[PDB]
Structure formats: C-alpha cells, structure tokens
Design a protein around this ligand. Sequence first.
Ligand SMILES: CNC(=O)c1cc(C2(C#N)CCC2)cc(NS(=O)(=O)c2cc(Br)cc(Cl)c2O)c1O
Length: 304
Amino acid sequence: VKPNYALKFTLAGHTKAVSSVKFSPNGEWLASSSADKLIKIWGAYDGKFEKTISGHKLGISDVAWSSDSNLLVSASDDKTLKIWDVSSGKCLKTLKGHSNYVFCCNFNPQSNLIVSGSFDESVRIWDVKTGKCLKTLPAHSDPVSAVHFNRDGSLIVSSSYDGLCRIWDTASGQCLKTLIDDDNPPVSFVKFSPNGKYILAATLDNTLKLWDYSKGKCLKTYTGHKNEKYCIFANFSVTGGKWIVSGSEDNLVYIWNLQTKEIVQKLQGHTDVVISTACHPTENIIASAALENDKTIKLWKSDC
Ligand SMILES: CNC(=O)c1cc(C2(C#N)CCC2)cc(NS(=O)(=O)c2cc(Br)cc(Cl)c2O)c1O
C-alpha cells in the first residue's frame, strides 16, 4: 500500500533560499521562511500568496506556529527570535539573548514557552507573554540544528552538528539523555513522534533514524535519499497512511513506509535540493521547498 501524491500548485515569491515550511495547526495556512529575511504566508489548500511578514535584519532559518495558529515564532541570523501575531502581522516581541545566529525554534504545546537553538551552542527557553529568557542550557559543542517539545511540554529534544541528540527536562534543565549510534555524524534535525514515544533524527550521512529515547534504542532507519550537507527536516505523515517524508539533495521528496522502511514514493519536479517539507494536519497534502536554483514551493495531494 502506497500513496499517490500528485502536484497541485507551485508557489513562488521568495528571492533567496527557503529554509523552512510549516502548516498551521488549523490547516488554513502554510508559512515559509527564507534567507531573504522574510516570512511568507500562503493559503494551504490553493497556494494563494497571502502576505509577507518583515522585520528581521538578516536571513531566517526557521519558523513555527503556536498551537492555536494565532502566533508564529521565527529564528534569524540577526541573533533574535521574533513572535508575530499572524492576523495583524505585528511583531509582538523580539527575543534577544543568543550570542550567535538562531537556527531553530518551536512553541511548547501550551504555547506559553518557546525553545530555541543557536550557532552559540545553546538551547534557550523563553516566556511568550513577556519575551524574556527563562533558562539557558549549555546544550552542545557545535551549532544546535533543531529543538522540539514533547507531548506535554515536560521534555525538550535538541540535535546538534556535534552528532548528539539530547533530551532535557524543561523545568530543571537537566540533560536526561544523550542518543548516539556507535558513530557521530552531524545531526541536522530531530523531533518527537506524534505519540510522543519516539524521536525522529536526521544525520548528514544520508540517514533518518527513529529512536525510543527512554530505552536508548534505534527502532527504525530510513535510507535511500541524499543528505550530506543541508538542514533537511523530516516529517511524520499522520492523515492517511503512516509515512515518513523528507526532502533530499537529489531534488526529490522521499516518502517511506513507517513500519517497513521501504520507499513508497518519490516526488519529482524540483530543480534543486529539496530543503524542507511539511505535512498538512488533516488532508493528505505535502508542501515541499527547494533551494535557490529552483526557488519554488510545491503542494502535492494524495488520495491516501
Ligand atoms: C500500526 N502502526 C502504528 O500504529 C505505529 C507504529 C510505530 C512504529 C512501527 N513500526 C514503532 C516504531 C515506529 C509508531 C507509531 N507511533 S508514531 O511513530 O508516533 C506515528 C507515526 C506516524 Br508516520 C503516524 C502516526 Cl499517527 C504515529 O502515531 C505508530 O502509531
């Protein structure tokens, strides 16, 4: 059993490399971020450009939605994060604290906290309402490539080019776990699984791994794509068949069977590295974004 994603819309607007695409939790919007210093908002179902959100002084590496789809947080080379009210476009807060480029960000499920990761080798935890830094974790020995909260917000997972995934207690800041698999390629992405039991991690040796982080066991690996250089997120597709989705440096989107780890589809059409993908929360829709030789975002839809 396999999906049949087919191309429905191609989106263009950004003038430099895209770094991230994310669907809003309410299904209405796609947000994208770029080295052009802009966030762009697009209609999730028809790909219609909605608006630009501007204010960062340098390129943006990541953007993330709050649980209620009302806010965005962005992470920039200008060493700030910004919290935005999406409907008005207003910058509610600028989060200053990191000493180098901010590379990743996420709200907790309650969307009262933000976690960030930086080239400064730290993870920071911020209060959304006040915009102030609550905690700084001396997390890694190289840039932090991803940060994500678990289901109830009590844990943070971080990944780094130092080759480590680490699990942090949100309240105490203690490093609870370090995951590594008898080799330490750089880790370019990590996130908790939909049910909260696993973490999915991308390493720059062309490999995705699904870990039981409590037991410290790698349960699945997904291979066949190309990923030796860029920060390419990976997704869980939860609306139809249980798939793992990722971009790839051979210009394709890869889709794997969660359980069997076989490739079930490859989506062709981009002319450069597929730097980012996202999966829609209710419909079988994938968004993909390619690097600057291509400069498009594509929306693909499947019947299953
Ligand atoms: C019928 N199989 C399952 O139900 C199932 C199997 C697995 C495993 C396997 N094989 C154990 C090691 C991966 C993990 C989960 N949970 S998951 O990773 O969080 C998850 C991933 C996706 Br894609 C979608 C959803 Cl909805 C989801 O929950 C499962 O749900």
